[PDB]
Amino acid sequence: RARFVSKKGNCNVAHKNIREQGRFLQDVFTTLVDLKWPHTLLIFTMSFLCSWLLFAMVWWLIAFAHGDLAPGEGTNVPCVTSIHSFSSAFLFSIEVQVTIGFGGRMVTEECPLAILILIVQNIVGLMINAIMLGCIFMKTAQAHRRAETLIFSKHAVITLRHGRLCFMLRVGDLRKSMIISATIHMQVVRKTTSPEGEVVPLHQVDIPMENGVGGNGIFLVAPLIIYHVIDSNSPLYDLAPSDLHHHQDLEIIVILEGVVETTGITTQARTSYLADEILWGQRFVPIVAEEDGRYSVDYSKFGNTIKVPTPLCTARQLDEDRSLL
Amino acid sequence: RARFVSKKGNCNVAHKNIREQGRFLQDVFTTLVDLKWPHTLLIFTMSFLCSWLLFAMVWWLIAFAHGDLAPGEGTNVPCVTSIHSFSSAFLFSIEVQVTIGFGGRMVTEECPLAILILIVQNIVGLMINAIMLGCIFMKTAQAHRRAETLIFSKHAVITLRHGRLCFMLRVGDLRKSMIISATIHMQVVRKTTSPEGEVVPLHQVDIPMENGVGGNGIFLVAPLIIYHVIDSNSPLYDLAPSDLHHHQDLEIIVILEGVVETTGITTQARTSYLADEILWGQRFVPIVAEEDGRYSVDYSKFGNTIKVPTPLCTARQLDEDRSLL
Amino acid sequence: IPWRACTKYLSSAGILLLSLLVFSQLLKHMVLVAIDYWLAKWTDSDQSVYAMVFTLLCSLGIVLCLVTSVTVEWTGLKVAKRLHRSLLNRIILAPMRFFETTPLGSILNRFSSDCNTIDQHIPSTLECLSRSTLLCVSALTVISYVTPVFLVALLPLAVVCYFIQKYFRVASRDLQQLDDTTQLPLLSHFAETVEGLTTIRAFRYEARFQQKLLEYTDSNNIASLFLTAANRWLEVRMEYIGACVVLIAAATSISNSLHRELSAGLVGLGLT
Amino acid sequence: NGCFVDALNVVPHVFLLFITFPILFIGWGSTWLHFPGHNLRWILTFILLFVLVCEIAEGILSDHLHLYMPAGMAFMAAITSVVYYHNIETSNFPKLLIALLIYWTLAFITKTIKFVKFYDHLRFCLTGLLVILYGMLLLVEVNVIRVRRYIFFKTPREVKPPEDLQDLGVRFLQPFVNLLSKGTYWWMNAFIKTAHKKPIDLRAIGKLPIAMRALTNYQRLCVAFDAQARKDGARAIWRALCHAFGRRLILSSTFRILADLLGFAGPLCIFGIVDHLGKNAYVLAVLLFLALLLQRTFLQASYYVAIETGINLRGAIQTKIYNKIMHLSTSNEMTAGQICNLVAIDTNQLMWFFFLCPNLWAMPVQIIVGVILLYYILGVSALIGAAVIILLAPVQYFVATKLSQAQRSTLEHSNERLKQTNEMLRGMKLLKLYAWESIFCSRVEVTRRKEMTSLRAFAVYTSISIFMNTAIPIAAVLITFVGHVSFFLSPSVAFASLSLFHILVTPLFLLSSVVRSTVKALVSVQKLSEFLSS
Ligand SMILES: Nc1ncnc2c1ncn2[C@@H]1O[C@H](COP(=O)(O)OP(=O)(O)OP(O)(O)=S)[C@@H](O)[C@H]1O
Ligand SMILES: Nc1ncnc2c1ncn2[C@@H]1O[C@H](COP(=O)(O)OP(=O)(O)OP(O)(O)=S)[C@@H](O)[C@H]1O
Structure with missing residues (x-):
């Protein structure tokens, strides 16, 4: 599609x-x-x-x-x-x-x-x-080339953290040079029909990135999994885990902005995840490891994934079960 | 370590x-x-x-x-x-x-x-x-050299302000030239294990900087101690005052961003405070003094510290005692 | 290991045979260089007298070599004798609490191996080390005498070898011991499988044990492989320097000993 | 217009040396990607190095700067091509390769013009060799663009750098480095420097590549054993090992024979130099330098490849006889000791014999080339000398055998001594409670004298070995030179004979140990077959 x-x-x-x-x-x-x-x-x-x-x-x-x-x-x-x-x-x-x-x-x-x-x-x-x-x-x-050096993992997984459903995606840097004040705008698109009979072909809606007390932006040194928690108020909260893999048409894009150090320009990077790209109930492998006197990061396991015995159900039904448990 | x-x-x-x-x-x-x-x-x-x-x-x-x-x-x-x-x-x-x-x-x-x-x-x-x-x-x-001229105090102390535990750290400028719209992103890292059995090697979480009605940024003219109040909702709120000095591994980093006036580029500065660097129950010496017709700032006492008779206890136990007193 | 262990080892032999060995080795190497030094003058052309002198040198060489070999043999045997007797006597007069404190393995093991190891390998290896070091010193002196200037070019390169020495030993020893360790639990493991074979085939635990043995043989091979890699490293680099020295020696000999020196008997010894 | 064509050749080297410097300086200011023809590229580059040395020799013989500058420029151009290819192996690009291809085409054009203008009228052979080498390197570049993405349709379908030797922490990367370092072991500099400071351990050591494990070697060996047993023993297991370890062993052996040839070649150029000065020598000196370095490098690569094949074989047959240990029956104490000796001495014998296998093929050609070369330098007298040295090789073997016999006897006595010690170091309090200790020490010393007595004969044989070692070199020259001139000599003849005498004495000792190792390995593989098939 x-x-x-x-x-x-x-x-x-x-x-x-x-x-x-x-x-x-x-x-x-x-x-x-x-x-x-x-x-x-x-x-x-x-x-x-x-x-x-x-x-x-x-x-x-x-x-x-x-x-x-x-x-x-x-x-x-x-x-x-x-x-x-x-x-x-x-x-x-x-x-x-x-x-x-x-x-x-x-x-x-x-x-x-x-x-x-x-x-x-x-x-x-x-x-x-x-x-x-x-x-x-x-x-x-x-400095779009510096927008080239950034990388995201090929597919994104969801998990259960703190008793609530969560979605995890990776990011990372590829050079010594930092990116100043990078911020995350995380958006979902879907063909939507309003209760007023209005049908939109595509409907961008913000899904929050969940950091400390607030804040739209992050700090990139090592690969940091971005951590959002979908709740009953969230727009993604209604879907089902068996209907996402094949039929539904849901693109989740992330836009990371930030200004590179040496030039001072403001670059960004944009990526999409389709309904067939995302998968359910897994966990990434820990990259960072305490090496000799430092932290070694291994990018071979960047896209690696392990199975986790987590319950498979819809976020609406999972919220109803949380009301029941 | x-x-x-x-x-x-x-x-x-x-x-x-x-x-x-x-x-x-x-x-x-x-x-x-x-x-x-x-x-x-x-x-x-x-x-x-x-x-x-x-x-x-x-x-x-x-x-x-x-x-x-x-x-x-x-x-x-x-x-x-x-x-x-x-x-x-x-x-x-x-x-x-x-x-x-x-x-x-x-x-x-x-x-x-x-x-x-x-x-x-x-x-x-x-x-x-x-x-x-x-x-x-x-x-x-x-203008990273302008990121060199900024300075932070070598170690950070915590105190009791307004009946609640507080942590104080100093910053300051080293030239006449100002830095426009500097903002503070204050982060804590820790090897964390989720209730789901997930262990992360390092876990960045935002701790808020506490200014007026809101706001992420500050105004730098004279050395301004940054003022946060840890509460039961804060992530740092659980630790103990006797376990920080030696054993625990807690890095508290601060990232101050801002654009310098003359070039217009956006620079920042990053520093870490380890569990062995931070100390408990003290107070900085007042730098600013009313001189002849102005305000004199003495940077000799910048890193100086005085003893203060404040109760020593864990923020969780201190919150329980506040519930009791 | 300091010079004190070797000092005691050679002082157990006594002053009688120490000099008899050292000076005989020096004289054998001096004869082995002097025969070629005289051959150098033999070349250019009293040919009969020359050949007779060559024969005299050839006889001196073999007689001295036999003498040196017999010396090394006799000295090694005497040292082994005295060391064993002294060890036995000193172990006899120990207090009872000493014997009860020290495990039996260490006290027995020294006699079991140390003695055997020394008798089997110390004399031959000592002879080989002495011959090698004296041959190397003799060759350096030859290529120095042949070329007055080549000498001044060879002292830099040799200093290079010093840096190649340290970095080698501090690893070559280490890897060595690691090999020994990966050899010990492997074999033992084998034996454990043989005796309790019925229990292991009964528990159906064959898969996990095969996994353990693959792990152990991998841990053995990585060590025995890094050791040969390091030996190859030292070999190749020392050889590259040993080729640099002959390059420089020949380049100096072709010009100095022909253009101005006008001597041809020199370049032969140096190149060879 | 000879100088005109010389300049026209100088130009493209300059073009490449000028484009290389920005990129090289940016790169100079952990995934290895290899391309087809890499090893061929490096081999051809070393051949270019050699031919360029020859061109410099020609330029020295002729001299006119502009007439020998092309060689001095192609030298730096080839070295910079090596630098480019290192910079591309470390990080892949489609453009740097085209940057090489342009230079190759232009250099081919200039060499063609040189060849034509020469045909219309030593130089001929060198120019032709350079033409052929540049053409083959061009074909390699064309292969590389044909493979993945020089210009070809849209996406490379690029390999995805090999995870076998580059994924998660590994330290012994032999198969995954530049074919120059595969020879000179340059990747060990980092390991040895880090090892100087921090003590090595299994956590500081790597993990074996997928190319050499228990599973890989066991898989290849069991596949060969299966393909041989489906067509149905000692000869069977032998041929199975042979067909299973295949190409690596013969590769090592041919490395070894080429090195042996060049080593026999060195002294002859020594001889030529000595002749020339007494009556074209700088060329011979630099050729001697090159031949020495190349011969020794090939010798060392041969050693390493053989050692690695042997380690593979040891791991393979060890895990195989452990797999057999699972299916054996309980009816078959003595068998346990025989099994653990089958792993402690028999397997080590097999592996060390596989170490020495290529030496057994390379020794005869070495002694044959040695004798034929010394005959043509000293004439009939040489033959006589060529006998004496050879006569040391069988004698040595005999000596060795005697040693072994002695060893056996000595070992027996030693064992008994240990027994008479194990008591004393256990009944310690009992022993010292009545001071009967001296009475037992007398007996212990009685055993020791017998042990000492055996050791005398052993060390006498060791002395005879060391004596012959340096006696035969002296005796050869003695009975040869005295038997040549005064019986039946420029300095070159005598000194070449001396060099060849040493270069032949070194291999002779190894043949004896090789024969012993081979017969012992044959017996041990018969034993392994008897066990593995019960
Ligand atoms: N098809 C188009 N593509 C690009 N720009 C357009 C297009 N149509 C209009 N615009 C411009 O963007 C604005 C969109 O307003 P419109 O849809 O055109 O309404 P409008 O009243 O008809 O204005 P007009 O066309 O200028 S009279 C206009 O002011 C145009 O200048
Ligand atoms: N080790 C690495 N170092 C740097 N960048 C990488 C690495 N691995 C992958 N990338 C890039 O960053 C993204 C991470 O996705 P991956 O972990 O590679 O998943 P993927 O499906 O296997 O994608 P590939 O490797 O391109 S087929 C990829 O699109 C790569 O282009």
């Missing part, structure tokens, strides 16, 4: 019938700073070559028009000394534009028109250099 | 068995912007020298191949005027690459192949210059 957002964190829902009013290009550089590296490098070299060829053509033409291009000895001084053909003119254009300044061909004080073309060439060169540096730097603050 | 996160704020837990899928290098520049200064300077000079030597070799070869390298008078004009040996060729490479443009050796309009090598040399030079500036700037927003 159709998934809401894919495991890799990319969004699945394909958009249709966007009334484009042009804002897609109106974000001129915040559009292309999104692109890949080959496309952005291609369009940067094309910017540079475009400008260089434009001014090389205009210079070729101005040297042709002054008549300094006509090879002649005396009665003149070329506006640009030692210019012969188009090739040397393009060499002059790249010599003055990108500010190498070879000086074999000298622009002279006889023609003020060449002064004007230089005084606009250089400023446009400097402006396009300034933007083509700022945008590549604004790019190198792409 | 083993500590969770070290006093300096660095993380202790050593990771084992990381299924490297290559994302460690896939973060190409967000990897090296983490590095120290000597390594980053080394790899930048190696980038620059690598590119320069590459193009110096190709230019040496092209001047050799055209035959302009063969010293001869007449019947030719070198593609690059006045080129003799490899040394002068490398001088030409560094002359055109890093955009000094000496112009003693002139590239000429006779050979379009030299035009091509120049028109790729310069663009690659400009791109690698752009990245090697953006990443060093993205580095100089390392």
Whole structure:
């Protein structure tokens, strides 16, 4: 069946019938700073070559028009000394534009028109250099790759903790670098029909993450199983344990947000768990172990799971049995 | 015994068995912007020298191949005027690459192949210059050093405030520059066994910071003792005052987050207090004092402590005695 | 183990045979190097007188070797005799409470093995150690004399070996004892299965016991495997250095002893 | 345009050495993934190292910097290719591999141009060998992209790094390291350094890989025994072990014979050097260095592979005879002692014989090459010398046998002594209550003298062994040199003969122990078959 957002964190829902009013290009550089590296490098070299060829053509033409291009000895001084053909003119254009300044061909004080073309060439060169540096730097603050290094366990299990049904999922870090003030927004989607006859195709509802006195966020050093307790007030509380594996369509997504240390940008990661991915009545294997003088974490058992003799029943019926026991 | 996160704020837990899928290098520049200064300077000079030597070799070869390298008078004009040996060729490479443009050796309009090598040399030079500036700037927003200037008192004491047991810890600032919207996430870890027979090697739980009507964050001007009150609902409420000093293994960590003013990045600081570090029944000495026309803060008494005649008993037993008194 | 145990072991032999052994070994190794030293001058070309001197050296070598071997034999036997007699006499005059305090295994075990072990292996191993160390010192002196400069290049590398020594022993001993331990409960386990075989086949406990024996044989193999891995490590690294030294020796000999030295009889001894 | 083609060759090495440095410096500033052709890649890289040494030799002979620079650049290029492949084995990528493939293609192109321009007109053979090696490495890279994901369709279907040797705490990782360290045991540096500080124990030690357990070796051995018994004994169990342990043993044996060949080769290049200077020698010196290191490395790898096969065999037959201990009948004291000797001495004999198995195949070729080589250096006289040394090998065996006999006798006496001690160290209070202790000590000393008497003959035989050990090397040179010149000599001849004499004396001693071990192992396997089939 159709998934809401894919495991890799990319969004699945394909958009249709966007009334484009042009804002897609109106974000001129915040559009292309999104692109890949080959496309952005291609369009940067094309910017540079475009400008260089434009001014090389205009210079070729101005040297042709002054008549300094006509090879002649005396009665003149070329506006640009030692210019012969188009090739040397393009060499002059790249010599003055990108500010190498070879000086074999000298622009002279006889023609003020060449002064004007230089005084606009250089400023446009400097402006396009300034933007083509700022945008590549604004790019190198792409830290979604740091959204790649995070990992979640492939499937999530539920258990019985403290006499109440609980669901456990793992997270973890993959580098030394921490993520500041990460917060968890844990959401459930379902095609819902209201008592008013209103049917929604998809209905996001927050399920709380259960920490100390409150709080939406967590602290990530070692793999920490996130711990929620479904109660009669919770939206997930009504389902049955035998109807989840095959038929029902329930996506439980988690969105972890946080700002990486060194860049300072705020990244996040998104993952979905389907009704066929989740399973019932198990327990993860303890990862952390007291090694020689530290805590060793073994990621081989990250996705490992052991059987646990826990009663199998619906959370509504389990709450009724708790009322009975 | 083993500590969770070290006093300096660095993380202790050593990771084992990381299924490297290559994302460690896939973060190409967000990897090296983490590095120290000597390594980053080394790899930048190696980038620059690598590119320069590459193009110096190709230019040496092209001047050799055209035959302009063969010293001869007449019947030719070198593609690059006045080129003799490899040394002068490398001088030409560094002359055109890093955009000094000496112009003693002139590239000429006779050979379009030299035009091509120049028109790729310069663009690659400009791109690698752009990245090697953006990443060093993205580095100089390392404000972890500002995470260094914060300080916490070496050990934390508990007291009796308002008829209820309380724990007091100090913090403080070390510069004029403020930290915007700092928030406190105060966590306790312990090897825990659930009533379901589940044993966890380490169990982070939030203990609230007790401010006005609510709120997770604080305001740092002068050293402010953070004030929590452990109650029967709190997770720390069950321990005994004689069993903490030696045997039990309880790390209480605090994570203070906040964004520094001038850079705008969000930094944090992390510290641990062990069961052997914390002590019982004391009071800090008042730091702030009304001086001549201001408030003087003396950091000599920062870690100083005075004895206080307070009853010594367990928080559970103290709550039972409060029920009795 | 300190030099005191060996000091007492050799002082039980007496001053009569200690020097008779040591100086004879030194002289045998000196003859074994001098024969090749004279062969070096033999090479370039009084060939008959040369060959006669070679024959004289060859005879001296074998006579001295026989003398040294007989010395080691006689000394080892005398030491074993005196040590056993002294041990018996000192155990005889002990108080009764001492005999009651110490278990019988330790008192009996020393005589059972220590004596046997020493008689079987101490003389041969001591002879081999002495021959090896003196041959090594002689070879170093040869490659030093052959090349005046090669000497100054070989003292660095040898110091390297010092660092390779420590790190080896402090592990090679350790692993060794571990092997012994994993050999002891294994065999014993076997015996326990043989006697109470009917009880074990009756309880149907064969599976758990087979599991235990797989565990024990794995614990034995891991030890006997790490030991051979460590021996291979030390072997390969010492050999790499032993090849570095011959490389440097030949590289110095080809130039120094031919270009300027103009001596060919040198490079032969050094390379060999 | 020779210099032009030399420069054209220098270029691609430079390209690769320049792209390697950023990545190498990021990587320099625990799952091992292996790719097909890894071992082939490292073998070919060592062959490249060798051919590059030869090219440097050619460049020395010719000299003109630009004419021998290509070798010095390909040297660093191949070392950096090794560094790249280490960086890829440690963390997998699809891009670094393409980064290698580009360089391989360009180097192949340059070498082809060199070959053509040479054909139109020593260099020829070296250039051809380099061409073949680069082509084979190219094919390896093409295989690697064909396997998983160079560009191929979407998802690699990548392996999922092997959990056998990389999952949950294991310390002895022999099968899961770089084929260079599989030879030089570099992975032991960490273990031995940690061992220096903290005392080793079973908690500090690893656990055996799935490649070598009781279950694995037992499974292979029982499969072979099943396939042999379904076609129906001593010969049967023998052939079963043979077919079960298969490729590893012959691999060790061929490592061993190649090492023996190179060891016989060393002294000849010594001889060549000695000849050249008395009348092309630096090349021989560096070749001697290379041949020494390679020969000894192959020898050591051979030893280790044989030892590991033997340990496998011991574990296998031990758990097998324990499996047999479950089904035996009660009618079959003496059998218990025979069983526990069948595990304490018979199994150790079997395993040590399996240690020495490849030596039994490699000894004859060693002595044959030795005798034929010394004959062509010293002529007919050599033959005479070649007899004397060989004559020490049977004599040694005889000596050994005498030792054994003596040992037996001595052991008997020793045992009796222990009995006469066990009483005294138990009736301690009884003994000292009337001071009859000296009376028993006299008897104990009486036994000791008999024990001492046996030990004299044993040590006499030990002395004869040690004496022959260093006497035959002297006697060979004596009766050879005196019997060559003054009966029937450049320094090279004499010193090569000396070297070969030592290189032949070292293996000769081992043949005697090998023969004894082999006959004892044959008897022990007959015993194991008689037991295992009751
Ligand atoms: N199909 C579309 N795709 C993207 N944007 C849209 C689309 N339709 C409308 N919008 C914009 O988003 C807002 C949605 O309001 P509408 O659904 O269009 O109601 P509206 O009264 O018809 O407004 P209009 O279409 O501009 S006259 C509008 O203000 C549009 O500017
Ligand atoms: N040891 C490890 N170290 C780092 N990352 C891992 C490790 N194991 C798995 N991952 C990644 O993090 C997720 C954890 O899921 P797993 O425990 O691997 O379950 P899984 O079903 O076996 O998924 P796989 O291994 O990709 S088929 C996976 O999607 C992996 O991409």
